[PDB]
Design a protein around this ligand. Structure first.
Ligand SMILES: CCCCCCCCCCCCCCCCCC(=O)OC[C@H](COP(=O)([O-])OCC(O)COP(=O)([O-])OC[C@@H](COC(=O)CCCCCCCCCCCCCCCCC)OC(=O)CCCCCCCCCCCCCCCCC)OC(=O)CCCCCCCCCCCCCCCCC
Ligand SMILES: COC1=C(OC)C(=O)C(C/C=C(\C)CC/C=C(\C)CC/C=C(/C)CC/C=C(/C)CC/C=C(/C)CC/C=C(\C)CC/C=C(\C)CC/C=C(/C)CC/C=C(/C)CCC=C(C)C)=C(C)C1=O
Ligand SMILES: CCCCCCCCCCCCCCCCC[C@@H](O)O[C@H](CO[C@H](O)CCCCCCCCCCCCCCC)COP(=O)(O)OCC[N+](C)(C)C
Ligand SMILES: CCCCCCCCCCCCCCCCC[C@@H](O)O[C@H](CO[C@H](O)CCCCCCCCCCCCCCC)COP(=O)(O)OCC[N+](C)(C)C
Ligand SMILES: CCCCCCCCCCCCCCCCC[C@@H](O)O[C@H](CO[C@H](O)CCCCCCCCCCCCCCC)COP(=O)(O)OCC[N+](C)(C)C
Ligand SMILES: CCCCCCCCCCCCCCCCC[C@@H](O)O[C@H](CO[C@H](O)CCCCCCCCCCCCCCC)COP(=O)(O)OCC[N+](C)(C)C
Ligand SMILES: CCCCCCCC/C=C\CCCCCCCC(=O)OC[C@H](COP(=O)(O)OCCN)OC(=O)CCCCCCC/C=C\CCCCCCCC
Ligand SMILES: CCCCCCCC/C=C\CCCCCCCC(=O)OC[C@H](COP(=O)(O)OCCN)OC(=O)CCCCCCC/C=C\CCCCCCCC
Ligand SMILES: CCCCCCCC/C=C\CCCCCCCC(=O)OC[C@H](COP(=O)(O)OCCN)OC(=O)CCCCCCC/C=C\CCCCCCCC
Ligand SMILES: CCCCCCCC/C=C\CCCCCCCC(=O)O[C@H](COC(=O)CCCCCCC/C=C/CCCCCCCC)COP(=O)(O)OCCN
Ligand SMILES: CCCCCCCC/C=C\CCCCCCCC(=O)O[C@H](COC(=O)CCCCCCC/C=C/CCCCCCCC)COP(=O)(O)OCCN
Ligand code: SF4
Lengths: 156, 105, 318, 70, 98, 115, 175, 83, 71
């Protein structure tokens, strides 16, 4: 039909716009934040993909949970997740953020950041190499590309 | 009170600005130079008390030049009568007023 | 036909700002031994479009504690003034030919600061309030020195008309006559646009984005375009004031090309300075301007009052 | 690359090209192609008004030479 | 008199009343003072321009200058008042009676 | 005519951009998202508390200095009088008084911020 | 009758004066004063006073910025007031607006005398002089005559500014 | 004249900005008095014809008043052409 | 020449206005046409409300705001 083509093209344009410019929040916790820094280093240069850090949650698109999430820190992480305007995505980096990792059985470590915030991509490692995190970001870009919002709205 | 030291020492500290017809830069004239000059020349010397009676005509002309109240009253009456005649339908304004008529260099 | 001129002045400035941002990322990246945006399009040429589309399709939120009216009004004022203060610039024919272009530009630049202040106050957050106070301090530091520098430089032009600056320096650049004022004016322009090392209003490492910390999607974008338009505009003003170009009345394209090239050189210098230096402190900036810049400016102003009378070279058009 | 910065700059330059020339062209198109008159003082405005009045077509840019005086 | 003159005069009257009402703060009264200054400046410059009084053109500028002094003066006092009470409320200025 | 047309066009464009920004995307705001922003936790006091000004004296001095430029800006036209000696003397006198006031405020520790 | 541009500007001037004259939390008072200053600059622009208007607007903007800082430092409360957040502020604002509207209507319909003298109306364009000028600007020449004619004014103004600096230093000295 | 040399050296070593500003201000204050070109500037200012030169009615006793702009009498700006 | 032309243009407008006033005010009982408002008998420059008083709006706008609004 005609409306289907229009909504498909508009959805493709919006998905490309959101994918080609991801602004992760400047938010690191532990060891994995060093590899997050090394992603921005000249060798890998995440900025060339349109991925640039921004400090304020209101001006951020992606949260990268890079490090252990302790019980004392969980309210802060949830609060800064809630303040990010939609659409928002969460990328879990490292074993500590994935499922507790080395400190899984500790009394003061949240066993996975997925208990506090919904996670889109899980990056395994301790710490994941900067190439692994770059692959995770590209996978998130592909996942954003696959999504179909306007097409679903039209078929309602 | 008024300790006139300017007159004693001949200084002219602030008298250059008191009136509108006193040596403007580049000889730019005031809007009511003639009326103010005439009133000043009439009232000079006789005194303040007499100048409010004998030089009343010149001061009235100066005030009329300054505020143009009588001219505005006359123009408003003229336009009121003109618009009333237009509403009744007897005036039929000329082309020059309309703007149809040709301008002159 | 005038609306055509208005649109032809407005839209290209917005496009230049959008690509200016792309240029800044690339220039900084190469300087930092990396590449910068080169994936979104050929040589990253589609990056600003993606940024704008992302920002204007994202949810804008009004904070609960915020005062809605001022919060909305501030970015509108910022963008409107940023677009407005472009009109009197002669390139080589100004859109609005005004008798006193410089005074109007000063007044609009002084009004521009209020938008930053209103946004900071209306955000109703501590970081935004600190950013607004820093803006107040910065304006207090730089305004008087900027005005006196402008007066001292324009004393050799003869009038405040911007078009007369083209014929004032028909033979030799004004920078060869008042280069100390040129450097002081450059530093004042850096401080006026809230640019590094004077970007204290935002203060990414201190105030976590500062005054616009609460502006999410659209108004934040408008603030960004306003700031970058101010950058390009103020640098173009500096190029016109100090680096005069040759104007042939039968071919203004030559002057337009020269003026655009000089403006681009100054903007690239701005990005260079941002990439090269650490950030000042908002009291050291005030001390630097009042303590060092002000005494020199007053002395220079006296010198440039005396010089035309000393050498019998008073400019025309009283 | 270092020359890959050149394309974007060029585009920006092209954008900065658009206003200036456009304004000039518009002026010409609206003033008979002869550099729209500048009226900073009252004397120049009076001259423009006189030209408009004697043009006979209510446009100041329609200049009348010696052929209009027989 | 044209409507503009009467509008400026009414603006002056409104600013004067606002100064004389003294709601709660001290800064608001200072703002009313600056408003009265601005209204006087506008009235004076309109009068000067209408009658082509050339030498009187520097009269408003001098006016403006002293305005600042007044404003500056007020602000200075305000500061000291705050430093005594932590608030610029006019209710606190009641130590001396008649 | 032209200047107010320019101002109206710019204001209309900015307002239209704000309208598109606020009405196009999907809005989902709840009480937690729109809360005031501290780094991670709730603010203790309020942003409307008095905030000390350590450079108040510099602010008042700027208030006084902002009219020295108002007095000095007509110099390009003033330099065209017949008696250049008087105009030069007056301008130099005004600038000297400005410099003397600045020096007085400098020596009396008026430019140092409050502790 | 000619679009009433000066009339509209003067009305906005009075409206801003009413807005900031009800003393609503000086931030908004500062906004009202800025609006009034800009509109007055436009008004005197319409009469040929370019330098004075821009000058007045420029001076006021600088002054307001200092004031915004001072109300943030010393004149703030928990819940800053606004024109609709208080009964007394709204009452004063509405009373001022109604008084302005009533005077405007009475002066437009009839030549009514309120305080000073009667009403004229018929637009303010009538009083403009038809006389022409030369290659100079009358306002610019009159203002620049300060340094050649007004030596006394310059002297007293400079002394006033220096004494003002000394005075603010002495007042805020403390002890 | 001996201590002032040490004071100048100390000022130049510690605060050169103030020294430069004071030197520039002093130069701008003194030099215009000694400049012989100030009178030329005054004459150039006086020679600019802003307003119309109103003719004088001939009473038969004006030998220095030209009867025509091209007549040899009256002020001449030949000094300006060489300047 | 401009001065000579201006005097003629000014005089013509006044004459045109005076003739129109004489036509209009013929039925008002106690109106003297062309009556001055000044006690003096010398020449007073027109107020520019007396010149373009009876003309159309665009003429008035060009007369009073033409120069200021031209940029
Ligand atoms: C008649 C007299 C003149 C009227 C002026 C305009 C008409 C006012 C009508 C409503 C305006 C505000 C909307 C509102 O009340 O809330 C709606 C609603 C409130 O809902 P809420 O969240 O539940 O309420 C929150 C709380 O109640 C509390 O929320 P809050 O604290 O934010 O509300 C306070 C707000 C509400 O307003 C009031 O309290 C009463 C309204 C009276 C305002 C008039 C005061 C005089 C100020 C100076 C003169 C202004 C110009 C006058 C001339 C007008 C003619 C052209 O007061 C203001 O903010 C007034 C500011 C408006 C001035 C704008 C001028 C721009 C200055 C730029 C610099 C100038 C350059 C030089 C020239 O908010 C919205 O719907 C969102 C959009 C609101 C902002 C959009 C843009 C601003 C509105 C346009 C203003 C006119 C600009 C031209
Ligand atoms: C060991 O101990 C530890 C620390 O100690 C050392 C830590 O620190 C720490 C925390 C640290 C981590 C969180 C890691 C943080 C990473 C590092 C600290 C630094 C890494 C990178 C930095 C941030 C440096 C970045 C600087 C670079 C140069 C990047 C570039 C800078 C940008 C900010 C400038 C560009 C700005 C943005 C990209 C926005 C621009 C986009 C615009 C707004 C869009 C354009 C505008 C449009 C709206 C125009 C629209 C107009 C239209 C007309 C256009 C046309 C559109 C139509 C459709 C046609 C941890 C955890 C730690 O353990
Ligand atoms: C206000 C005026 C403007 C209005 C809106 C128009 C904005 C301009 C549109 C911008 C066009 C560019 C979009 C696509 C760029 C091409 C990039 C290409 O590669 O995208 C591919 C597919 O792109 C999309 O399919 C195309 C999207 C464009 C949709 C066309 C819409 C046209 C605009 C219509 C707007 C209004 C419609 C009319 C109704 C109102 C997928 O690539 P991707 O995997 O990611 O990246 C590869 C990474 N590598 C290189 C490392 C391997
Ligand atoms: C008066 C003249 C003014 C000129 C001003 C100066 C120049 C301004 C122009 C700015 C230059 C923009 C950079 C463009 C680089 C070229 C990119 C292009 O080569 O890539 C193509 C992008 O193609 C886009 O259509 C071109 C978009 C560039 C124009 C957008 C600039 C925004 C201003 C106007 C917006 C209107 C957009 C209308 C077209 C959508 C590939 O996309 P696409 O072919 O798809 O492939 C994906 C689809 N597949 C998978 C099915 C094959
Ligand atoms: C870039 C510069 C140039 C741009 C030029 C174009 C300017 C565009 C104007 C800016 C608005 C664009 C926004 C796009 C969406 C429209 C927003 C709104 O007006 O539409 C609906 C508003 O409609 C109302 O809900 C109901 C309207 C019922 C009243 C009818 C209007 C009166 C007409 C009488 C009816 C007769 C037939 C109507 C057709 C003429 C949306 O309601 P709401 O859900 O809240 O908002 C969320 C929108 N989402 C879903 C896209 C996220
Ligand atoms: C005489 C009494 C002395 C004791 C009292 C002293 C207290 C008062 C302070 C100084 C008195 C000011 C008197 C100056 C009046 C100005 C008139 C005179 O001076 O001539 C002027 C000449 O001015 C000279 O420059 C001298 C004045 C310079 C004064 C130096 C400033 C120092 C004064 C001290 C107090 C200032 C504050 C503190 C400073 C430390 C202008 O003459 P001219 O231009 O031909 O004609 C103009 C008219 N035209 C245009 C139509 C042709
Ligand atoms: C469509 C109808 C548009 C009506 C907009 C009127 C304002 C309004 O209430 O909009 C509300 C909306 C927020 O409501 P939400 O509940 O968050 O979202 C609802 C949409 N889903 O707020 C807005 O969008 C405001 C939009 C701005 C309106 C434009 C007018 C602004 C005028 C500013 C004038 C000042 C300019 C100063 C600069 C000039 C100086 C020279
Ligand atoms: C906003 C701040 C307003 C600032 C306006 C400045 C405009 C300006 O300076 O242009 C001057 C320009 C050039 O003239 P000259 O310099 O004399 O030389 C050429 C003529 N021979 O003169 C003009 O065009 C004047 C025309 C009228 C001025 C415009 C007045 C509008 C002022 C803004 C009001 C905005 C609305 C008011 C309410 C605001 C909030 C609702
Ligand atoms: C200045 C430079 C930047 C330019 C700024 C404007 C750019 C405009 C480009 C338009 C791109 C197309 C935008 C489409 C995305 C709109 C936002 C969106 O995704 O909304 C999704 C939403 C999903 O809602 P539901 O599924 O029903 O609810 C589920 C939740 N319970 O779908 C919609 O409702 C949107 C439908 C289409 C909206 C109309 C867009 C048409 C184009 C108009 C653009 C106007 C430009 C002027
Ligand atoms: C014969 C009669 C001639 C009359 C003489 C006239 C010439 C006078 C000669 C001297 C002129 C010197 C002018 C210097 C201007 C002020 C500089 C200054 O003194 O300030 C610096 C500080 O200035 C800065 O550091 C600013 C840093 C900002 C860096 C920005 C980028 C650096 C430069 C980039 C290129 C500049 C381009 C200039 C021209 C641009 C084209 C328009 C000193 O500060 P402190 O070190 O803290 O010392 C005081 C504490 N004891
Ligand atoms: C009558 C002539 C007037 C015209 C010329 C002047 C025009 C304007 C220039 C002066 C502006 C105001 C000057 C203010 C003076 C302030 C002095 C001061 O107290 O500052 C001292 C510092 O300054 C000093 O060292 C004292 C004065 C030093 C010398 C000042 C000038 C002396 C004369 C120099 C030039 C001599 C003549 C020129 C010779 C040129 C060589 C041939 C305090 O140090 P801080 O920076 O505040 O704090 C440091 C600790 N953290
Ligand atoms: S996953 Fe490993 S490297 Fe990363 S924060 Fe946890 S312990 Fe450190």
């Amino acid at each position: 039909s005609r409306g289907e083509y229009v909504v498909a093209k508009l959805d493709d344009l919006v998905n490309w716009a959101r994918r080609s410019s991801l602004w992760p929040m400047t938010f690191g916790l532990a060891c994995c934040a060093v590899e997050m820094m090394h992603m921005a280093a000249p060798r890998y240069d995440m900025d060339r993909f349109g991925v640039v850090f921004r400090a304020s949650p209101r001006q951020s698109d992606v949260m990268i949970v890079a490090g252990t999430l302790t019980n004392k820190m969980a309210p802060a992480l949830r609060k800064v997740y809630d303040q990010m305007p939609e659409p928002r995505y969460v990328v879990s980096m490292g074993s500590c953020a994935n499922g507790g990792g080395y400190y899984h059985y500790s009394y003061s470590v949240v066993r996975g950041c997925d208990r506090i915030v919904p996670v889109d991509i899980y990056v395994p490692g301790c710490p994941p190499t900067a190439e692994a995190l770059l692959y995770g970001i590209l996978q998130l870009q592909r996942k954003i590309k696959r999504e179909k919002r306007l097409r679903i709205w039209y078929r309602r | 009170p008024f300790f006139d030291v300017q007159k004693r020492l001949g200084l002219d500290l602030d008298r250059w600005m008191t009136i509108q017809s006193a040596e403007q830069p580049h000889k730019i004239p005031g809007r009511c130079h003639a009326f103010e000059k005439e009133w000043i020349e009439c009232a000079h010397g006789i005194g303040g008390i007499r100048a409010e009676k004998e030089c009343k005509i010149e001061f009235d002309d100066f005030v009329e030049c300054l505020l143009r109240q009588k001219t505005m009253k006359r123009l408003s009456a003229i336009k009121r009568q003109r618009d009333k005649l237009i509403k009744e339908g007897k005036y039929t304004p000329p082309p020059h007023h309309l703007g149809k008529e040709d301008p002159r260099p | 036909m005038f609306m055509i001129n208005i649109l032809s002045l407005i839209i290209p400035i917005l496009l230049a700002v959008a690509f200016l941002t792309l240029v800044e990322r690339k220039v900084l990246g190469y300087m930092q031994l990396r590449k910068g945006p080169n994936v979104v399009g050929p040589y990253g040429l589609l990056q600003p479009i993606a940024d704008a589309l992302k920002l204007f399709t994202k949810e804008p939120l009004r904070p609960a504690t915020s005062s809605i009216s001022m919060f909305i009004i501030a970015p509108i004022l910022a963008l409107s003034l940023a677009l407005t203060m472009w009109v009197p610039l002669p390139m080589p024919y100004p859109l609005i030919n005004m008798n006193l272009g410089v005074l109007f530009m000063l007044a609009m630049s002084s009004l521009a600061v209020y938008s930053i202040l209103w946004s900071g106050w209306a955000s109703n957050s501590k970081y935004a309030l600190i950013g607004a106070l820093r803006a107040v301090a910065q304006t207090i530091s730089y305004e008087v020195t900027l005005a006196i520098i402008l007066l001292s430089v324009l004393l050799m032009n003869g009038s405040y008309t911007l078009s007369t600056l083209i014929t004032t320096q028909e033979h030799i650049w004004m920078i060869f006559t008042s280069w100390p004022l040129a450097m002081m004016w450059f530093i004042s322009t850096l401080a006026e646009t809230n640019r590094a090392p004077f970007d204290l209003t935002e203060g990414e490492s201190e105030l976590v984005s500062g005054f616009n910390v609460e502006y999410a999607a659209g108004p934040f974008a408008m603030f960004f375009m306003a700031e970058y338009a101010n950058i390009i505009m103020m640098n173009a003003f500096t190029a016109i004031l100090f680096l005069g170009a040759s104007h042939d009345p039968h071919t203004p394209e030559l002057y337009t090309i020269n003026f655009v090239l000089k403006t681009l050189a100054l903007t690239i210098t701005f990005l260079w300075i941002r990439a090269s230096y650490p950030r000042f402190r908002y009291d050291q900036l005030m001390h630097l301007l009042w303590k060092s810049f002000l005494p020199l400016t007053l002395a220079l102003c006296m010198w440039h009052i005396s010089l035309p009378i000393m050498t019998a070279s008073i400019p025309p058009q009283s | 690359m270092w020359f890959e910065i050149l394309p974007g700059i060029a585009v920006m330059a092209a954008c900065l090209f658009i206003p200036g020339m456009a304004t000039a062209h518009i002026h010409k198109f609206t003033n008979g192609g002869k550099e729209k008159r500048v009226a900073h003082f009252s004397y120049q405005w009076n001259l423009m008004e006189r030209d408009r009045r004697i043009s006979g077509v209510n446009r100041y840019h329609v200049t009348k030479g010696l052929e209009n005086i027989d | 008199m044209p409507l503009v003159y009467m509008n400026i005069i009414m603006a002056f009257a409104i600013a004067l009343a606002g100064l004389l009402m003294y709601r709660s703060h001290l800064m608001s009264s200072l703002l009313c003072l600056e408003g009265m200054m601005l209204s006087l400046f506008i009235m004076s410059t309109l009068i000067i321009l209408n009658t082509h009084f050339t030498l009187a053109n520097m009269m408003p500028i001098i006016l403006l200058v002293f305005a600042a002094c007044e404003a500056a003066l007020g602000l200075s006092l305000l500061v000291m008042v705050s430093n005594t009470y932590g608030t610029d409320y006019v209710q606190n200025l009641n130590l001396l009676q008649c | 005519m032209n200047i107010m047309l320019t101002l109206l066009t710019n204001v209309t464009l900015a307002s239209l951009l704000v309208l598109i920004a606020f009405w196009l995307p999907q809005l989902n705001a709840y009480s937690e998202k729109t809360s005031p922003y501290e780094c991670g936790f709730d603010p203790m006091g309020s942003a409307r508390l008095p905030f000390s000004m350590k450079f108040f004296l510099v602010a008042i001095t700027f208030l006084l200095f902002d009219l020295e430029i108002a007095l000095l800006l007509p110099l390009p036209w003033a330099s065209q009088t017949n008696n250049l000696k008087t105009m030069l003397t007056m301008a130099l006198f005004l600038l000297i008084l400005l410099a003397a006031s600045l020096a007085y405020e400098w020596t009396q520790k008026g430019l140092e911020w409050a502790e | 009758m000619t679009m009433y541009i000066a009339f509209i500007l003067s009305t906005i001037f009075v409206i801003g004066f009413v807005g900031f004259s009800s003393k609503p939390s000086p931030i908004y008072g500062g906004l009202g004063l800025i609006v009034s200053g800009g509109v007055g600059c436009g008004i005197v622009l319409n009469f040929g006073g370019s330098f004075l208007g821009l000058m007045v607007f420029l001076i006021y903007l600088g002054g307001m910025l200092v004031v915004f800082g001072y109300t943030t430092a010393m004149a703030t409360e928990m819940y800053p007031e606004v024109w609709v957040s208080n009964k007394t502020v709204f009452g004063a604002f509405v009373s001022g607006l109604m008084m302005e509207f009533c005077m405007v209507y009475y002066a437009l319909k009839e030549e009514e005398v309120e305080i000073i003298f009667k009403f004229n109306g018929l637009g303010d364009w009538v009083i403009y002089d038809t006389g022409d000028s030369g290659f100079f600007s009358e306002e610019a020449m009159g203002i620049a005559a300060l340094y050649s004619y007004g030596t006394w004014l310059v002297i007293v103004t400079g002394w006033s500014l220096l004494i003002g600096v000394v005075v603010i230093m002495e007042i805020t000295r403390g002890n | 004249a001996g201590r002032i040399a040490s004071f100048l050296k100390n000022a130049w070593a510690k605060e050169p900005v103030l020294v430069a500003s004071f030197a520039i201000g002093g130069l701008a204050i003194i030099l215009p008095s000694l400049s012989p070109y100030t009178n030329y500037a005054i004459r150039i200012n006086r020679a600019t014809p802003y307003n119309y030169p109103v003719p004088l009615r001939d009473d038969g006793n004006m030998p220095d008043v030209p009867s025509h702009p091209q007549d040899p009498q009256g002020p001449s700006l030949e000094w300006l052409k060489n300047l | 020449l401009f001065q000579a032309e201006k005097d003629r243009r000014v005089l013509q407008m006044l004459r045109e206005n005076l003739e129109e006033e004489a036509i209009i005010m013929k039925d008002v009982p106690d109106w003297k046409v062309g009556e001055s408002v000044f006690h003096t008998t010398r020449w007073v420059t027109p107020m520019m409300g007396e010149l373009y008083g009876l003309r159309t709006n665009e003429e008035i706008l060009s007369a009073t705001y033409g120069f200021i609004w031209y940029t």
